[PDB]
Amino acid sequence: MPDLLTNVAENYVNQDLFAGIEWRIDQDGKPIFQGCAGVKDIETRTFIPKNAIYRIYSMTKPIVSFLAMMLIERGVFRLSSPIQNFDPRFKSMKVIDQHAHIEPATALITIEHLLTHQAGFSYDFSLGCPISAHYRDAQLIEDGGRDLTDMMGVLAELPLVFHPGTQWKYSISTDVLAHIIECATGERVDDLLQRLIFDPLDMQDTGFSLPLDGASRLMEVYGMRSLAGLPALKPAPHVLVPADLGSSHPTDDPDFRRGGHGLYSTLDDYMAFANMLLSGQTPEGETLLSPAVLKLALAPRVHFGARGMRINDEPFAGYSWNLLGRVMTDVGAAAYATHLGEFGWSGAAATYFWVDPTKNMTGCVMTQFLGSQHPIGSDMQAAAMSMLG
Amino acid sequence: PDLLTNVAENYVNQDLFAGIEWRIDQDGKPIFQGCAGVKDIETRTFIPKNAIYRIYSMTKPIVSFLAMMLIERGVFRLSSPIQNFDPRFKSMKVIDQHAHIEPATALITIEHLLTHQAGFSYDFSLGCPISAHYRDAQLIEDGGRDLTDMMGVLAELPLVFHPGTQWKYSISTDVLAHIIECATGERVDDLLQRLIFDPLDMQDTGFSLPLDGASRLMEVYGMRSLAGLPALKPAPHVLVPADLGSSHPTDDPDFRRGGHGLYSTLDDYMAFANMLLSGQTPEGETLLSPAVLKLALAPRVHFGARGMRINDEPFAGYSWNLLGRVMTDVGAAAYATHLGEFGWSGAAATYFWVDPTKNMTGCVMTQFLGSQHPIGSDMQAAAMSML
Ligand SMILES: C[C@H](C(=O)O)c1cccc(C(=O)c2ccccc2)c1
Ligand SMILES: C[C@H](C(=O)O)c1cccc(C(=O)c2ccccc2)c1
């Protein structure tokens, strides 16, 4: 019953493992626990500003996935839609394996494959993956200044690493999804996110560029995990040194937009999104997604074998995959406190959130550390679970 | 006793075959030979001198041998993708018995064609997922269509498995004949004439009848029909003349195929069979080197418990080499043979064998489509027993 959340965060700051941390836990749509620890940057020790801004990386994916579900509801496409219907550059895909064998794909990539990371795409930083070296040579993630549409043209020429539908591998497929959304609608994904999600939820600080007053609110990002170079064979030491993002994550590029990363947000903005996922509605009662399609989106859809869900061989114990991210399907296999049906996702800079329908609960932890050797997100979830009976 | 004569005469006396010729050679010279019956039961004309037979799939070892000669001469190789010579065979699809279609994951090669592992089917393959589409396209029925044009129609149809992954007796020897034409810029009938028939003095073998051939052509009997669907049970074995429609013209100067269509004689086919003991003409001219003949005869496709089957009929103890069947287990065989015996047969019940352990060749010529009696194997067994 003590405040384990503050204890976790203060200990991380006091041990020089994270510069600054913010968190909020809501229940029934209202804050029940919240706090902050540390500073905006350790170089000057400026205090965490009001409505501090974070690079949320793959916490972009549940947002872009939710947009796709809205467009499915509105009839733009369906889960079974072949993506080549919208961009013929994804016609005639090939599949490569670890033995240098290449053959034509025997199934078409669908919207559902993109949402479930079963399309056969890879990721630039996937260690040991048969094709990731070719992704890195193409600078798919590193070259943030390249237009989404043009990056997709380069990706489309590369082989998949399995036949669509047959395996699971966490991937660039959410970026493909953002692009296919643009093809299917004739609109830009950032404009669609603004009009259909951010504005109805009053997420005024969320987007692919900083707000006008955003520079002074941007949290510094730390860590040794590097985008420029080969995936490491052992984790870099966990040290608070400012991270060099190269040109991968611009702050003021009006055309920068992605599906798998790239949003800036705030704790308050992301909690508005997370709370919405408990119902599909805005706080006033506008429906962003009907209950039936929200249930379709949250139902466990990819189930895993004995070794479970893994990303670069890191486990997500007891989790299955739904159309928006992870979902807890076996508390008896879980590695940290949770409840059946808890869902959410996380980002490369150690941001983390969850939604727990059994407790009408949402939680989010914001920090900026790339390559963390400490699972701060899960530690904060566990603390909150222990505090909510 | 003359077991060969007893088998043949019994077949004639029981009204099962109209006329039968046979010859067995050892060391290039006849040791057994005979005939029984007539050219046609309607007029009871005797089997003529140098009687002519439609040899159907005994065309395949000849066209396969030609392909081996062209391999030896560097025209192509076993691993050559056929799409290099005819791009209509680029981007093949594969269909299955559950209506699923997907792109082929391997290219069809020359070796696939020679081994019936390319994924092609045959018009009369009962139960085969794609054979209905072959029949709708009249691939075998339409004998007047030029080989090149028939191949264009075939190339648009899906395979029934991915190239290299299974065995199914098929139209692939016709594809091989066509790819030979593409690779050489010559016609397959002209190549066969120059490279095989003329050196072996096979003056009566070809895709059309000789000028004096009409009176020598044996009548063909049987109820197995090319027209309709493959039958669910065999038609009665009765001596009624067969209607070939337009599938097997006698005087079309452009008719040529890889899997069927040759006319030949007993003497001509024995010249070919005897050559396969050495790769040489009787005079000693080399048609195929010993090394490539060995490559062609070595067992290349091995079969599971069900063994080699064509429309579910077994070839017990046989494996497949680049020219046809080859005996690989005498203890599995269903009739007398020796290890390494090889050869093939045709739809009108013609049959031949080469037995290297005995320096022996044999051929039985008759004309019956849809036979319910294995006359070829009965005659091989009789000949083996007379040694
Ligand atoms: C999967 C990972 C995440 O969001 O978890 C992700 C997605 C997209 C981009 C990036 C990066 O920019 C990056 C930065 C430093 C090192 C490696 C990658 C990381
Ligand atoms: C497979 C079979 C054979 O040579 O064994 C074959 C190959 C080619 C053509 C034909 C036919 O014309 C035919 C004639 C009557 C009935 C069915 C097919 C038969």
PDB file of N, CA and C in Angstrom, chain B residues 270-319:
ATOM      1  N   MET B 270      13.589 -52.233 -82.983  1.00  0.00           N
ATOM      2  CA  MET B 270      14.676 -53.074 -82.500  1.00  0.00           C
ATOM      3  C   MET B 270      16.042 -52.467 -82.803  1.00  0.00           C
ATOM      4  N   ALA B 271      16.184 -51.756 -83.931  1.00  0.00           N
ATOM      5  CA  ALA B 271      17.443 -51.068 -84.193  1.00  0.00           C
ATOM      6  C   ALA B 271      17.722 -50.030 -83.115  1.00  0.00           C
ATOM      7  N   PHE B 272      16.687 -49.296 -82.704  1.00  0.00           N
ATOM      8  CA  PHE B 272      16.841 -48.310 -81.641  1.00  0.00           C
ATOM      9  C   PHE B 272      17.156 -48.987 -80.311  1.00  0.00           C
ATOM     10  N   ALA B 273      16.400 -50.031 -79.965  1.00  0.00           N
ATOM     11  CA  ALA B 273      16.639 -50.717 -78.697  1.00  0.00           C
ATOM     12  C   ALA B 273      18.041 -51.319 -78.642  1.00  0.00           C
ATOM     13  N   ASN B 274      18.484 -51.961 -79.725  1.00  0.00           N
ATOM     14  CA  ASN B 274      19.827 -52.529 -79.719  1.00  0.00           C
ATOM     15  C   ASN B 274      20.883 -51.447 -79.539  1.00  0.00           C
ATOM     16  N   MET B 275      20.652 -50.263 -80.114  1.00  0.00           N
ATOM     17  CA  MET B 275      21.612 -49.174 -79.971  1.00  0.00           C
ATOM     18  C   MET B 275      21.787 -48.782 -78.504  1.00  0.00           C
ATOM     19  N   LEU B 276      20.712 -48.847 -77.714  1.00  0.00           N
ATOM     20  CA  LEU B 276      20.776 -48.453 -76.309  1.00  0.00           C
ATOM     21  C   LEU B 276      21.661 -49.366 -75.463  1.00  0.00           C
ATOM     22  N   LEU B 277      22.076 -50.528 -75.978  1.00  0.00           N
ATOM     23  CA  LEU B 277      23.046 -51.338 -75.249  1.00  0.00           C
ATOM     24  C   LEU B 277      24.444 -50.738 -75.272  1.00  0.00           C
ATOM     25  N   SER B 278      24.724 -49.825 -76.203  1.00  0.00           N
ATOM     26  CA  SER B 278      26.081 -49.321 -76.393  1.00  0.00           C
ATOM     27  C   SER B 278      26.165 -47.834 -76.671  1.00  0.00           C
ATOM     28  N   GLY B 279      25.112 -47.198 -77.182  1.00  0.00           N
ATOM     29  CA  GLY B 279      25.201 -45.851 -77.698  1.00  0.00           C
ATOM     30  C   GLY B 279      25.754 -45.754 -79.103  1.00  0.00           C
ATOM     31  N   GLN B 280      25.963 -46.884 -79.783  1.00  0.00           N
ATOM     32  CA  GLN B 280      26.581 -46.932 -81.107  1.00  0.00           C
ATOM     33  C   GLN B 280      25.642 -47.553 -82.137  1.00  0.00           C
ATOM     34  N   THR B 281      25.876 -47.211 -83.405  1.00  0.00           N
ATOM     35  CA  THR B 281      25.264 -47.939 -84.504  1.00  0.00           C
ATOM     36  C   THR B 281      25.925 -49.306 -84.638  1.00  0.00           C
ATOM     37  N   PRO B 282      25.317 -50.223 -85.394  1.00  0.00           N
ATOM     38  CA  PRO B 282      25.968 -51.523 -85.608  1.00  0.00           C
ATOM     39  C   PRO B 282      27.331 -51.391 -86.252  1.00  0.00           C
ATOM     40  N   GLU B 283      27.546 -50.337 -87.036  1.00  0.00           N
ATOM     41  CA  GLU B 283      28.830 -50.098 -87.686  1.00  0.00           C
ATOM     42  C   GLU B 283      29.870 -49.517 -86.741  1.00  0.00           C
ATOM     43  N   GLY B 284      29.470 -49.086 -85.546  1.00  0.00           N
ATOM     44  CA  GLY B 284      30.393 -48.535 -84.578  1.00  0.00           C
ATOM     45  C   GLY B 284      30.389 -47.027 -84.451  1.00  0.00           C
ATOM     46  N   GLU B 285      29.545 -46.323 -85.206  1.00  0.00           N
ATOM     47  CA  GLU B 285      29.425 -44.877 -85.060  1.00  0.00           C
ATOM     48  C   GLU B 285      28.770 -44.554 -83.722  1.00  0.00           C
ATOM     49  N   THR B 286      29.342 -43.605 -82.993  1.00  0.00           N
ATOM     50  CA  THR B 286      28.828 -43.230 -81.679  1.00  0.00           C
ATOM     51  C   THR B 286      27.712 -42.203 -81.832  1.00  0.00           C
ATOM     52  N   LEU B 287      26.519 -42.525 -81.322  1.00  0.00           N
ATOM     53  CA  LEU B 287      25.454 -41.530 -81.248  1.00  0.00           C
ATOM     54  C   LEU B 287      25.449 -40.807 -79.912  1.00  0.00           C
ATOM     55  N   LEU B 288      25.783 -41.518 -78.838  1.00  0.00           N
ATOM     56  CA  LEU B 288      25.851 -40.932 -77.504  1.00  0.00           C
ATOM     57  C   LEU B 288      27.015 -41.578 -76.775  1.00  0.00           C
ATOM     58  N   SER B 289      27.839 -40.761 -76.110  1.00  0.00           N
ATOM     59  CA  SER B 289      29.023 -41.298 -75.460  1.00  0.00           C
ATOM     60  C   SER B 289      28.649 -42.260 -74.330  1.00  0.00           C
ATOM     61  N   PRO B 290      29.550 -43.174 -73.977  1.00  0.00           N
ATOM     62  CA  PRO B 290      29.262 -44.052 -72.835  1.00  0.00           C
ATOM     63  C   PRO B 290      28.957 -43.283 -71.559  1.00  0.00           C
ATOM     64  N   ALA B 291      29.643 -42.164 -71.321  1.00  0.00           N
ATOM     65  CA  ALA B 291      29.420 -41.434 -70.076  1.00  0.00           C
ATOM     66  C   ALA B 291      28.016 -40.844 -70.018  1.00  0.00           C
ATOM     67  N   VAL B 292      27.536 -40.291 -71.132  1.00  0.00           N
ATOM     68  CA  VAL B 292      26.221 -39.667 -71.088  1.00  0.00           C
ATOM     69  C   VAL B 292      25.132 -40.728 -71.164  1.00  0.00           C
ATOM     70  N   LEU B 293      25.389 -41.844 -71.854  1.00  0.00           N
ATOM     71  CA  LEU B 293      24.436 -42.949 -71.802  1.00  0.00           C
ATOM     72  C   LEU B 293      24.272 -43.457 -70.376  1.00  0.00           C
ATOM     73  N   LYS B 294      25.377 -43.583 -69.635  1.00  0.00           N
ATOM     74  CA  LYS B 294      25.288 -43.979 -68.231  1.00  0.00           C
ATOM     75  C   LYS B 294      24.494 -42.960 -67.426  1.00  0.00           C
ATOM     76  N   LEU B 295      24.748 -41.668 -67.658  1.00  0.00           N
ATOM     77  CA  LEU B 295      23.981 -40.620 -66.987  1.00  0.00           C
ATOM     78  C   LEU B 295      22.491 -40.763 -67.283  1.00  0.00           C
ATOM     79  N   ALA B 296      22.156 -41.117 -68.527  1.00  0.00           N
ATOM     80  CA  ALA B 296      20.765 -41.240 -68.942  1.00  0.00           C
ATOM     81  C   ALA B 296      20.089 -42.477 -68.358  1.00  0.00           C
ATOM     82  N   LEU B 297      20.836 -43.558 -68.126  1.00  0.00           N
ATOM     83  CA  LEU B 297      20.220 -44.807 -67.693  1.00  0.00           C
ATOM     84  C   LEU B 297      20.200 -44.971 -66.179  1.00  0.00           C
ATOM     85  N   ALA B 298      20.999 -44.197 -65.458  1.00  0.00           N
ATOM     86  CA  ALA B 298      21.091 -44.382 -64.017  1.00  0.00           C
ATOM     87  C   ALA B 298      19.746 -44.080 -63.361  1.00  0.00           C
ATOM     88  N   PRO B 299      19.333 -44.857 -62.365  1.00  0.00           N
ATOM     89  CA  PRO B 299      18.065 -44.558 -61.687  1.00  0.00           C
ATOM     90  C   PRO B 299      18.097 -43.166 -61.079  1.00  0.00           C
ATOM     91  N   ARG B 300      17.065 -42.385 -61.380  1.00  0.00           N
ATOM     92  CA  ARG B 300      17.047 -40.958 -61.066  1.00  0.00           C
ATOM     93  C   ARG B 300      15.864 -40.534 -60.213  1.00  0.00           C
ATOM     94  N   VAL B 301      14.707 -41.175 -60.370  1.00  0.00           N
ATOM     95  CA  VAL B 301      13.553 -40.956 -59.508  1.00  0.00           C
ATOM     96  C   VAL B 301      13.257 -42.256 -58.798  1.00  0.00           C
ATOM     97  N   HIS B 302      13.193 -42.194 -57.475  1.00  0.00           N
ATOM     98  CA  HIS B 302      12.890 -43.353 -56.658  1.00  0.00           C
ATOM     99  C   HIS B 302      11.528 -43.150 -56.017  1.00  0.00           C
ATOM    100  N   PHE B 303      10.808 -44.247 -55.804  1.00  0.00           N
ATOM    101  CA  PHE B 303       9.415 -44.153 -55.408  1.00  0.00           C
ATOM    102  C   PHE B 303       9.181 -44.752 -54.029  1.00  0.00           C
ATOM    103  N   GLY B 304       8.137 -44.255 -53.380  1.00  0.00           N
ATOM    104  CA  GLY B 304       7.773 -44.681 -52.045  1.00  0.00           C
ATOM    105  C   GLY B 304       7.074 -46.024 -52.045  1.00  0.00           C
ATOM    106  N   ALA B 305       6.302 -46.254 -50.981  1.00  0.00           N
ATOM    107  CA  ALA B 305       5.664 -47.553 -50.804  1.00  0.00           C
ATOM    108  C   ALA B 305       4.706 -47.858 -51.948  1.00  0.00           C
ATOM    109  N   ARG B 306       3.908 -46.868 -52.363  1.00  0.00           N
ATOM    110  CA  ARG B 306       2.994 -47.079 -53.483  1.00  0.00           C
ATOM    111  C   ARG B 306       3.740 -47.364 -54.777  1.00  0.00           C
ATOM    112  N   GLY B 307       5.022 -47.007 -54.850  1.00  0.00           N
ATOM    113  CA  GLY B 307       5.795 -47.245 -56.051  1.00  0.00           C
ATOM    114  C   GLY B 307       5.416 -46.302 -57.184  1.00  0.00           C
ATOM    115  N   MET B 308       6.019 -46.572 -58.340  1.00  0.00           N
ATOM    116  CA  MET B 308       5.701 -45.842 -59.558  1.00  0.00           C
ATOM    117  C   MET B 308       4.302 -46.228 -60.032  1.00  0.00           C
ATOM    118  N   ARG B 309       3.444 -45.237 -60.284  1.00  0.00           N
ATOM    119  CA  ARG B 309       2.090 -45.513 -60.761  1.00  0.00           C
ATOM    120  C   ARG B 309       1.679 -44.512 -61.828  1.00  0.00           C
ATOM    121  N   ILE B 310       0.923 -44.992 -62.813  1.00  0.00           N
ATOM    122  CA  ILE B 310       0.326 -44.152 -63.848  1.00  0.00           C
ATOM    123  C   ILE B 310      -1.158 -44.481 -63.895  1.00  0.00           C
ATOM    124  N   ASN B 311      -2.003 -43.481 -63.620  1.00  0.00           N
ATOM    125  CA  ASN B 311      -3.434 -43.701 -63.398  1.00  0.00           C
ATOM    126  C   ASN B 311      -3.659 -44.882 -62.453  1.00  0.00           C
ATOM    127  N   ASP B 312      -2.837 -44.942 -61.410  1.00  0.00           N
ATOM    128  CA  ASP B 312      -2.890 -45.922 -60.328  1.00  0.00           C
ATOM    129  C   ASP B 312      -2.489 -47.326 -60.756  1.00  0.00           C
ATOM    130  N   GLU B 313      -1.996 -47.507 -61.982  1.00  0.00           N
ATOM    131  CA  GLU B 313      -1.464 -48.821 -62.345  1.00  0.00           C
ATOM    132  C   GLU B 313      -0.004 -48.906 -61.925  1.00  0.00           C
ATOM    133  N   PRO B 314       0.426 -50.004 -61.304  1.00  0.00           N
ATOM    134  CA  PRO B 314       1.791 -50.076 -60.779  1.00  0.00           C
ATOM    135  C   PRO B 314       2.818 -50.533 -61.799  1.00  0.00           C
ATOM    136  N   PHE B 315       4.041 -50.080 -61.563  1.00  0.00           N
ATOM    137  CA  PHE B 315       5.233 -50.549 -62.258  1.00  0.00           C
ATOM    138  C   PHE B 315       6.154 -51.057 -61.161  1.00  0.00           C
ATOM    139  N   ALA B 316       5.902 -52.296 -60.737  1.00  0.00           N
ATOM    140  CA  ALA B 316       6.476 -52.807 -59.500  1.00  0.00           C
ATOM    141  C   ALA B 316       7.971 -53.047 -59.644  1.00  0.00           C
ATOM    142  N   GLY B 317       8.747 -52.483 -58.721  1.00  0.00           N
ATOM    143  CA  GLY B 317      10.186 -52.625 -58.749  1.00  0.00           C
ATOM    144  C   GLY B 317      10.908 -51.701 -59.704  1.00  0.00           C
ATOM    145  N   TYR B 318      10.190 -50.842 -60.423  1.00  0.00           N
ATOM    146  CA  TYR B 318      10.793 -49.922 -61.378  1.00  0.00           C
ATOM    147  C   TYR B 318      11.026 -48.552 -60.757  1.00  0.00           C
ATOM    148  N   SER B 319      12.164 -47.963 -61.097  1.00  0.00           N
ATOM    149  CA  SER B 319      12.457 -46.550 -60.904  1.00  0.00           C
ATOM    150  C   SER B 319      12.416 -45.875 -62.270  1.00  0.00           C
TER     151      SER B 319
END
